[PDB]
């Protein structure tokens, strides 16, 4: 109304990430006023809009530090406070005790040994947010309680997760003393790790596909005894098929670009378009990224971490020998009114037995057919050719799953201190995860569904801390807290993993049921979950979609590229042919498989199966210890210092969960005064 | 936990875990007797041998099958294969896994529900199933459209189904297999002057049949090819340093799954009865029955089998349709990888029959939850 | 735009009004399953509409919702409405307009039930009913023209001048092509060929469309028939099975012309032809003597239009002149007529609106369609 | 020169003279032969054996029909039962004698012209004439309207009539009778261990099902009786001394003329094949048409089949009509009964078939001298 008062105006426009801008009221003449949001562009408003102008609460013009004392709590609301902050160089924001980060993409002078000894014995509302104060009050915590602390990093692709883990290492190691080896030694495992578990996505060139724990081990006195590097949840499926616009591990392309020509011919390796795992995005070379300084970077961390070049040899020989078993084509025949194959002559076939040190007939007759051994004899049995491509796409991605174990253990053999504690078990530790984040693209599949999965869990292990925390607010100040509901997301749960005929099994069991296909496994799914609220089947009988209902939404999944991710054939026969190997560093990875060798009878475990078994792992290690949240957020999509997306960071803070806090806030008691505050009225 | 399979025929065991490649145990059903003196005090005393310790120890003990024709005859003596498969074989406490079985379609009521109280009273499984074996046939072939002939060592069964759907009017039961035709093998082997008569002597006869029979393409051929030449002569080693020779006796044994009639059978051969189990069903089903034959069962390892049932059926068909005969080479083990894959499914979990029901209905419940 | 499905009692023809041919064609027909489902994990249905109930012809037990022009299933006609919309279509069908056909003379309740199902059912925003022998003459592109419309339920004539129609010399018989069908099935137990099911008899019809003629003088041609082997024909069951025919290709499509082989007390088409046009004005039936439309597929008889013509100049007077209209897509000529007719802009004031709907109940339709 | 009416059916064969009153040779319809091996030399041995003599020895015998579902299959086996019939039962040679056969109501017209040429050819009669089951039924209850429900061993047909003009298009012709009802009880006996498979067996389990099965009024509530008591239960000796006992095979067993889903048919029951038989007809003929359904054939003579007949005509008709079951206690006789009525009638005497007319046109002039 006046000429100098803010207010929430709110331009309705065809937009799923809109929500009203602030601006303040300007040159106010005539019957229509002039209006200029926060992003600087002039509006006029006429007399027929006057529902779209509200007055904006005086908490909400100034800003503030912790989200959760907003006047005005909803999704507007949180958007200006962080955006009025982000110009004035202000990147960590409070909601409750949750630290929103938003990726600068610059360099702030906030990371000082002036910052740290500031932030140094003080809880969280004494100082203004920061990355130290989470790990202030963390490392406080443990002494005081005695228990493990942790702390969960999550957001897209490229919003500092990575950096915000090694800034809560730059205070933790100076808190205790000297910074030591293990902080440098730590930093060295990161490009190590980056190009073993680190992909090109759709949205980011550097993207985890993995969760990454750095459990940090202390002692009495409060000092760094050793540090542990726990992978889980790895995208396996990556290996042998990657998405349009989207390539296969940096590991492959690096080592490509950065060999000798000498020795990428002892390993009979050459360009890296004539690669078929390599090559199927059409994304060989990325922009932003060398992968000829990248390989020597790799190289010089793993000389740090004690990597000999015999080790560096062997572990290029069985990459090298993934990207020539890709290259072999199938041809389907018929042995007798049965399927069968025939694998066609290509240099590839001779090159992976003698990097893979097995005989060439050896290997021949591994991938074309099984034998079933019973007590008295054993049968050799043909694999038709959409068999014959499930072992050789899941002895590749044997490999390197194990191939991955023996890099993190290798790590783990010069920063991990075993207990000196061996006459009394007294150490507390702090974990780090960096996991990532709910993902809606325009198409999803089967990576997307995991990885939206891993999050419902997570998502709700932090619905019940927040649950709990508020609770004990009310408690006290003496306020019963008998009629909030406290809901959680168990529907979506009880759908897709804790249920009997679940999501996940019904994917698993048409990917071993007769004759089946995508098309099956839809009806299979809608025929049970078509009576469900979170399940949306598909309209049409042609169409090869379903939708289920996360906490951030609606998410639709193509049915078509199922039950190919899901396969992990291991046959007896492959773990018969490593122990048979020449090769002692292949039968080195394979320790555990070849002690058990005629144990394999046992069908080997689908992808789903063993993400389902890291995520049961991952949640018992959370469960263990007081839960500390931050939130990444980047504001841009070009990756430049100054300039903050408001439909960016909207979609950002719905896909967080983070908005579950204001929910409950509302539903009990959102206003909160002091007896000084009886003075007005 | 985890789901027993158990197929649990008239011949062999075949025993195991649910989700596996293939059974664990697999011993003869047979349960062992000494019939002669122990003079030797202090001996280890035994009263019964069952399985492999029986055919160890084969020379001074009676052998006897509970099972005959899929019946199971001797329920005592049945029982104590189920314990040895249990507690010796699998080591595993019954009373903590699901249960699966299998039984010949056209079997007597009360087999099954015997199954179903022994199963739920002495062992206390806490559920069970049983399952027909030409079905379990198809889920180990990846297919859901079939005519599955399974021929063990008491039946041999044909049963059509199209798209998952079993037609019950044409499933077919004969009472011939590998006992008949070791039971004949022993018969026509006096002829060369080998008399074969104790129950330790049919076992080794049913080696010699397993080692040397075969199937002819052209039975009255290989007649005239025997009695002209001696190409088709070959020996066998007995237990005790004897060697025995046979002739035409190797493919005149096999024979009579084609011509029942040499046992004194009035029942129509294996091919003769798949054409007329096809020709029963509807005429939109038969051209997708013809090149679906599937053969399982211990019975159909002869060599020449497959070519025989396809020459015969093809005969027998218009020359339009395309006969073709499916004999995978693990087909002795089908029912079982069949049985595998069922009590590994999802939607399987819901089709138990938990003791609750069985405690409150009685052991007529099989026949309203199994097929 | 809008939507055209003429509702036949064998095909339903679905599409767009202004397309110049139908997009889905499928029969109309329901299965269930009728065997018992052993394998477990197979994906059950518990029906099966059109194309893929006639694929898994074996294992069901095929029913048709509509016998001789009146809908008798109600529940599975809306199961066949909603195939037609969601999954031929791919439409929504609170989105269009739908334009249907019926037959000259049924129940008013099989008008009404249609008008309350489309309303409140499937929500359009408004629908019609139309005359199936009126859209010939649209899809002929004549205004003046007797049309002899044959599906496979009924057989009626509906005499037209310069856009007018006599409703008192409009004529319905209910011997069409499943009654061809069902004698076909009947005369062929004389040779030893039993076909007995609702899956043989797709295979009967088979037969019927593919080797049946109308003979041009029956008498000289049962006697050509035994004469010599010269007409007949062989044809492979879908089991390899061959069967020969011979005479009975034209004995079946004789019943049309004498309904006396059935048991039915009813002039032939010929003569209910020239009935309907001699019931008419003096002046009007020179016009329509030659304008004779012939609209359906069983229409499509080899030798059909001939037959007509000589036995339609046997009962006219010598002077006149008889021309029979056989357009070679004779088939599809009630919906093209319809898309036509759907495509006009003075149509567009005679859609049944919901408002309408609303304000006076289904009956409506009986003020607003013809 | 009196004349001969053979009422030779699947099963059974009605011989006798025209003018009688009952049926003089009425034997069995088989044909056995030797299947086993002969080894007294000097006993007197015959090749084939036809009629009652198939049934005393049929332990050494393979019987066949030679007439399937009122097809004749085996003209040779006909031609052997036709001469058996005429000279060891009727003992008349059949040159001086005119005959009178029967035939089903829709049979391919190959099988009355063979018919035709035999008799006129092989046995040279003088006059010949082929008559309808239901007409001759209708003559042997002595009515001129009705609608006939004839059930045999072959076929089930409806032919009705009024005031004696038949209505072609409203007969229906079903191919299920005695026979798979003696396969579907020697199917569903092997549910307690019976099993029956030799062709000889077969004979038995006729006869079984001849004295123990009968038709229940209410299926639901007859089953809910057989499986709360033992009142239901019956035995019966086997021709080696062996004891049966049924206890609902008796009434599940003749249903699948009510329901004959039980043996895979897609048809309607015989109920339902009446009906809309009757209301295919005009109208005003339904009204007598209801009031005069005959039974007639060997099938009909089940207890309680003219009860539940009338009770489901009375539920598919109008509840203001008078449905009415005539079933004579003679009725397995009815069709020979009427035929001797037929052939001893002064203005049927210029119907028949006559040799010269058989010369001069051929065997296609049974088509418009008959029916
Ligand atoms: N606090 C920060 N200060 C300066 N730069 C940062 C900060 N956080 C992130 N970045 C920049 O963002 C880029 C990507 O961050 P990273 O943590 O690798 O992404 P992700 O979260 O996907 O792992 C880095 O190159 C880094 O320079
Ligand atoms: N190589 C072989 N050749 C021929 N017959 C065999 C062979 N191996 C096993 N058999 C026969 O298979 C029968 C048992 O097979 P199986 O199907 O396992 O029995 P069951 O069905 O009773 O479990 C034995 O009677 C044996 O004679
Ligand atoms: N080529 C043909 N010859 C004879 N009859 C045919 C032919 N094609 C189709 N028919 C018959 O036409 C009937 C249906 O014709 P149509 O009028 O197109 O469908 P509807 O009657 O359902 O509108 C079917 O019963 C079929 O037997
Ligand atoms: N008392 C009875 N109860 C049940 N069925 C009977 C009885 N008597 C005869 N039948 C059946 O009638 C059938 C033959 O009857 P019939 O009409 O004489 O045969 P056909 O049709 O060959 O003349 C036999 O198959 C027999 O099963
Ligand atoms: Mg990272
Ligand atoms: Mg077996
Ligand atoms: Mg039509
Ligand atoms: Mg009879």
Same mark, same amino acid.
């Given at each position: 109304? #006046?000429?100098?008062?803010?207010?929430?105006?709110?331009?309705?426009?065809?937009?799923?990430?809109?929500?009203?801008?602030?601006?303040?009221?300007?040159?106010?003449?005539?019957?229509?006023?002039?209006?200029?949001?926060?992003?600087?562009?002039?509006?006029?408003?006429?007399?027929?809009?006057?529902?779209?102008?509200?007055?904006?609460?005086?908490?909400?013009?100034?800003?503030?530090?912790?989200?959760?004392?907003?006047?005005?709590?909803?999704?507007?609301?949180?958007?200006?406070?962080?955006?009025?902050?982000?110009?004035?160089?202000?990147?960590?924001?409070?909601?409750?005790?949750?630290?929103?980060?938003?990726?600068?993409?610059?360099?702030?002078?906030?990371?000082?040994?002036?910052?740290?000894?500031?932030?140094? %014995?003080?809880?969280?509302?004494?100082?203004?947010?920061?990355?130290?104060?989470?790990?202030?009050?963390?490392?406080?915590?443990?002494?005081?309680?005695?228990?493990?602390?942790?702390?969960?990093?999550?957001?897209?692709?490229?919003?500092?997760?990575?950096?915000?883990?090694?800034?809560?290492?730059?205070?933790?190691?100076?808190?205790?003393?000297?910074?030591?080896?293990?902080?440098?030694?730590?930093?060295?495992?990161?490009?190590?790790?980056?190009?073993?578990?680190?992909?090109?996505?759709?949205?980011?060139?550097?993207?985890?596909?993995?969760?990454?724990?750095?459990? =940090?081990?202390?002692?009495?006195?409060?000092?760094?005894?050793?540090?542990?590097?726990?992978?889980?949840?790895?995208?396996?499926?990556?290996?042998?098929?990657?998405?349009?616009?989207?390539?296969?591990?940096?590991?492959?392309?690096?080592?490509?670009?950065?060999?000798?020509?000498?020795?990428?011919?002892?390993?009979?390796?050459?360009?890296?378009?004539?690669?078929?795992?390599?090559?199927?995005? %059409?994304?060989?070379?990325?922009?932003?990224?060398?992968?000829?300084?990248?390989?020597?970077?790799?190289?010089?961390?793993?000389?740090?971490?004690?990597?000999?070049?015999?080790?560096?040899?062997?572990?290029?020989?069985?990459?090298?020998? =993934?990207?020539?078993?890709?290259?072999?084509?199938?041809?389907?025949?018929?042995? @007798?009114?049965?399927?069968?194959?025939?694998?066609?002559?290509?240099?590839?076939?001779?090159?992976?037995?003698?990097?893979?040190?097995?005989?060439?007939?050896?290997?021949?007759?591994?991938?074309?057919?099984?034998?079933?051994?019973?007590?008295?004899?054993?049968?050799?049995?043909?694999?038709?050719?959409?068999?014959?491509?499930?072992?050789?796409?899941?002895?590749?991605?044997?490999?390197?799953?194990?191939?991955?174990?023996?890099?993190?253990?290798?790590?783990?053999?010069?920063?991990?201190?075993?207990?000196?504690?061996?006459?009394?078990?007294?150490?507390?530790?702090?974990?780090?995860?960096?996991?990532?984040?709910?993902?809606?693209?325009?198409?999803?599949?089967?990576?997307?569904?995991?990885?939206?999965?891993?999050?419902?869990?997570?998502?709700?292990?932090?619905?019940?801390?927040?649950?709990?925390?508020?609770?004990?607010?009310?408690?006290?100040?003496?306020?019963?807290?008998?009629?909030?509901?406290?809901?959680?997301?168990?529907?979506?749960?009880?759908?897709?993993?804790?249920?009997?005929?679940?999501?996940?099994?019904?994917?698993?069991?048409?990917?071993?049921?007769?004759?089946?296909?995508?098309?099956?496994?839809?009806?299979?799914?809608?025929?049970?979950?078509?009576?469900?609220?979170?399940?949306?089947?598909?309209?049409?009988?042609?169409?090869?979609?379903?939708?289920?209902?996360?906490?951030?939404?609606?998410?639709?999944?193509?049915?078509?590229?199922?039950?190919?991710?899901?396969?992990?054939?291991?046959?007896?026969? =492959?773990?018969?042919?490593?122990?048979?190997?020449?090769?002692?560093?292949?039968?080195?990875?394979?320790?555990?498989?070849?002690?058990?060798?005629?144990?394999?009878?046992?069908?080997?475990?689908? #992808?789903?199966?063993?993400?389902?078994?890291?995520?049961?792992?991952?949640?018992?290690?959370?469960?263990?210890?007081?839960?500390?949240?931050?939130?990444?957020?980047?504001?841009?999509?070009?990756?430049?210092?100054?300039?903050?997306?408001?439909?960016?960071?909207?979609?950002?803070?719905?896909?967080?969960?983070?908005?579950?806090? =204001?929910?409950?806030?509302?539903?009990?008691?959102?206003?909160?005064?002091?007896?000084? @505050?009886?003075?007005?009225? | 936990?985890?789901?027993?399979?158990?197929?649990?025929?008239?011949?062999?065991?075949?025993?195991?875990?649910?989700?596996?490649?293939?059974?664990?145990?697999?011993?003869?059903?047979?349960?062992?007797?000494?019939?002669?003196?122990?003079?030797? +005090?202090?001996?280890?005393?035994?009263?019964?041998? +069952?399985?492999?310790?029986?055919?160890?120890?084969?020379?001074?003990?009676?052998?006897?099958?509970?099972?005959?024709?899929?019946?199971?005859?001797?329920?005592?003596?049945?029982?104590?294969?189920?314990?040895?498969?249990?507690?010796?074989?699998?080591?595993?406490?019954?009373? $903590?896994?699901?249960?699966?079985?299998?039984?010949?379609?056209?079997?007597?009521?009360?087999?099954? $529900?015997?199954?179903?109280?022994?199963?739920?009273?002495?062992?206390?499984?806490?559920?069970?199933?049983?399952?027909? &074996?030409?079905?379990?046939?198809?889920?180990?072939?990846?297919?859901?459209?079939?005519?599955?002939?399974?021929?063990?060592?008491?039946?041999?069964?044909? +049963?059509?189904?199209?798209?998952? !759907?079993?037609?019950?009017?044409?499933?077919?039961?004969?009472?011939?297999?590998?006992?008949?035709?070791?039971?004949?093998?022993?018969?026509?082997?006096?002829?060369?002057?080998?008399?074969? +008569?104790?129950?330790?002597?049919? $076992?080794?006869?049913?080696?010699?049949?397993?080692?040397?029979?075969?199937?002819?393409?052209?039975?009255?051929?290989?007649?005239?090819?025997?009695?002209?030449?001696?190409?088709?002569?070959?020996?066998? $080693?007995?237990?005790?340093?004897?060697?025995?020779?046979?002739?035409?006796?190797?493919?005149?044994?096999?024979?009579?799954?084609?011509?029942?009639?040499?046992?004194?059978?009035?029942?129509?051969?294996?091919?003769?009865?798949?054409?007329?189990?096809?020709?029963?069903?509807?005429?939109?089903?038969?051209?997708?029955?013809?090149?679906?034959?599937?053969?399982?069962?211990?019975?159909?390892? !002869?060599?020449?089998?497959?070519?025989?049932?396809?020459?015969?059926?093809?005969?027998?068909?218009?020359?339009?349709?395309?006969?073709?005969?499916?004999?995978?080479?693990?087909?002795?083990?089908?029912?079982?990888?069949?049985?595998?894959?069922?009590?590994?499914?999802?939607?399987?979990?819901?089709?138990?029959?938990?003791? &609750?029901?069985?405690?409150?209905?009685?052991?007529?419940?099989?026949?309203?939850?199994?097929?």
């Amino acid at each position: 109304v #006046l000429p100098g008062d803010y207010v929430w105006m709110d331009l309705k426009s065809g937009q799923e990430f809109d929500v009203p801008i602030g601006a303040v009221v300007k040159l106010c003449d005539s019957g229509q006023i002039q209006v200029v949001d926060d992003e600087d562009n002039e509006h006029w408003i006429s007399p027929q809009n006057a529902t779209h102008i509200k007055p904006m609460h005086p908490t909400s013009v100034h800003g503030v530090e912790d989200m959760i004392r907003l006047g005005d709590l909803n999704e507007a609301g949180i958007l200006r406070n962080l955006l009025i902050r982000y110009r004035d160089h202000l990147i960590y924001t409070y909601t409750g005790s949750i630290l929103v980060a938003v990726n600068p993409y610059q360099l702030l002078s906030i990371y000082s040994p002036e910052h740290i000894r500031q932030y140094t %014995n003080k809880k969280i509302g004494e100082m203004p947010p920061h990355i130290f104060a989470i790990a202030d009050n963390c490392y406080f915590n443990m002494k005081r309680n005695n228990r493990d602390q942790c702390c969960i990093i999550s957001g897209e692709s490229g919003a500092g997760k990575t950096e915000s883990t090694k800034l809560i290492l730059q205070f933790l190691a100076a808190i205790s003393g000297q910074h030591s080896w293990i902080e440098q030694q730590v930093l060295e495992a990161t490009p190590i790790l980056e190009a073993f578990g680190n992909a090109k996505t759709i949205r980011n060139d550097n993207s985890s596909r993995f969760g990454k724990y750095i459990d =940090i081990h202390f002692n009495k006195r409060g000092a760094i005894e050793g540090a542990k590097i726990e992978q889980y949840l790895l995208e396996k499926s990556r290996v042998c098929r990657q998405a349009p616009d989207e390539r296969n591990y940096h590991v492959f392309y690096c080592m490509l670009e950065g060999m000798n020509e000498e020795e990428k011919k002892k390993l009979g390796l050459g360009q890296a378009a004539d690669y078929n795992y390599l090559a199927m995005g %059409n994304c060989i070379t990325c922009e932003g990224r060398v992968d000829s300084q990248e390989y020597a970077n790799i190289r010089s961390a793993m000389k740090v971490l004690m990597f000999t070049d015999t080790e560096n040899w062997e572990i290029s020989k069985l990459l090298a020998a =993934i990207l020539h078993m890709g290259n072999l084509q199938y041809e389907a025949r018929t042995f @007798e009114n049965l399927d069968a194959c025939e694998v066609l002559f290509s240099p590839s076939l001779a090159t992976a037995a003698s990097l893979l040190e097995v005989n060439p007939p050896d290997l021949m007759s591994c991938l074309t057919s099984r034998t079933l051994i019973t007590r008295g004899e054993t049968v050799s049995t043909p694999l038709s050719r959409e068999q014959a491509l499930d072992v050789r796409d899941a002895f590749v991605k044997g490999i390197y799953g194990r191939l991955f174990v023996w890099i993190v253990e290798k790590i783990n053999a010069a920063i991990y201190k075993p207990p000196p504690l061996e006459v009394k078990n007294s150490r507390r530790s702090i974990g780090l995860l960096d996991i990532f984040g709910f993902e809606n693209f325009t198409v999803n599949s089967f990576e997307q569904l995991c990885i939206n999965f891993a999050n419902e869990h997570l998502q709700q292990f932090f619905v019940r801390h927040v649950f709990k925390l508020e609770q004990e607010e009310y408690d006290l100040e003496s306020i019963d807290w008998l009629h909030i509901e406290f809901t959680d997301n168990q529907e979506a749960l009880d759908m897709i993993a804790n249920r009997p005929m679940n999501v996940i099994s019904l994917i698993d069991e048409e990917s071993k049921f007769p004759k089946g296909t995508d098309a099956t496994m839809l009806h299979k799914l809608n025929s049970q979950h078509k009576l469900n609220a979170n399940y949306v089947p598909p309209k049409n009988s042609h169409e090869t979609q379903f939708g289920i209902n996360h906490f951030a939404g609606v998410v639709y999944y193509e049915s078509q590229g199922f039950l190919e991710k899901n396969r992990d054939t291991l046959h007896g026969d =492959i773990i018969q042919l490593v122990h048979s190997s020449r090769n002692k560093f292949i039968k080195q990875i394979f320790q555990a498989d070849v002690a058990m060798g005629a144990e394999t009878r046992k069908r080997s475990p689908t #992808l789903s199966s063993q993400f389902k078994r890291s995520l049961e792992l991952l949640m018992r290690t959370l469960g263990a210890c007081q839960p500390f949240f931050v939130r990444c957020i980047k504001p841009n999509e070009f990756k430049k210092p100054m300039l903050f997306d408001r439909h960016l960071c909207v979609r950002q803070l719905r896909y967080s969960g983070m908005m579950e806090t =204001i929910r409950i806030r509302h539903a009990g008691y959102p206003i909160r005064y002091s007896f000084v @505050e009886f003075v007005e009225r | 936990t985890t789901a027993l399979v158990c197929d649990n025929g008239s011949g062999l065991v075949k025993a195991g875990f649910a989700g596996d490649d293939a059974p664990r145990a697999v011993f003869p059903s047979i349960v062992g007797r000494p019939r002669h003196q122990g003079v030797m +005090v202090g001996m280890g005393q035994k009263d019964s041998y +069952v399985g492999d310790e029986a055919q160890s120890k084969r020379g001074i003990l009676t052998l006897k099958y509970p099972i005959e024709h899929g019946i199971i005859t001797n329920w005592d003596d049945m029982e104590k294969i189920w314990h040895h498969t249990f507690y010796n074989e699998l080591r595993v406490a019954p009373e $903590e896994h699901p249960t699966l079985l299998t039984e010949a379609p056209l079997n007597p009521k009360a087999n099954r $529900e015997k199954m179903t109280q022994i199963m739920f009273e002495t062992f206390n499984v806490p559920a069970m199933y049983v399952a027909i &074996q030409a079905v379990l046939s198809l889920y180990a072939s990846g297919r859901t459209t079939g005519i599955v002939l399974d021929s063990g060592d008491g039946v041999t069964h044909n +049963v059509p189904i199209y798209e998952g !759907y079993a037609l019950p009017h044409a499933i077919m039961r004969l009472d011939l297999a590998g006992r008949d035709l070791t039971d004949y093998l022993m018969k026509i082997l006096t002829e060369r002057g080998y008399s074969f +008569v104790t129950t330790a002597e049919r $076992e080794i006869v049913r080696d010699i049949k397993e080692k040397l029979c075969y199937v002819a393409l052209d039975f009255e051929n290989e007649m005239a090819t025997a009695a002209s030449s001696s190409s088709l002569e070959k020996s066998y $080693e007995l237990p005790d340093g004897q060697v025995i020779t046979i002739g035409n006796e190797r493919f005149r044994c096999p024979e009579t799954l084609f011509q029942p009639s040499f046992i004194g059978m009035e029942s129509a051969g294996i091919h003769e009865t798949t054409y007329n189990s096809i020709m029963k069903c509807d005429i939109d089903i038969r051209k997708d029955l013809y090149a679906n034959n599937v053969m399982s069962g211990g019975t159909t390892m !002869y060599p020449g089998i497959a070519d025989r049932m396809q020459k015969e059926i093809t005969a027998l068909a218009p020359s339009t349709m395309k006969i073709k005969i499916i004999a995978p080479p693990e087909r002795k083990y089908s029912v079982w990888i069949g049985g595998s894959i069922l009590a590994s499914l999802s939607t399987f979990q819901q089709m138990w029959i938990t003791k &609750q029901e069985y405690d409150e209905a009685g052991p007529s419940i099989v026949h309203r939850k199994c097929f």
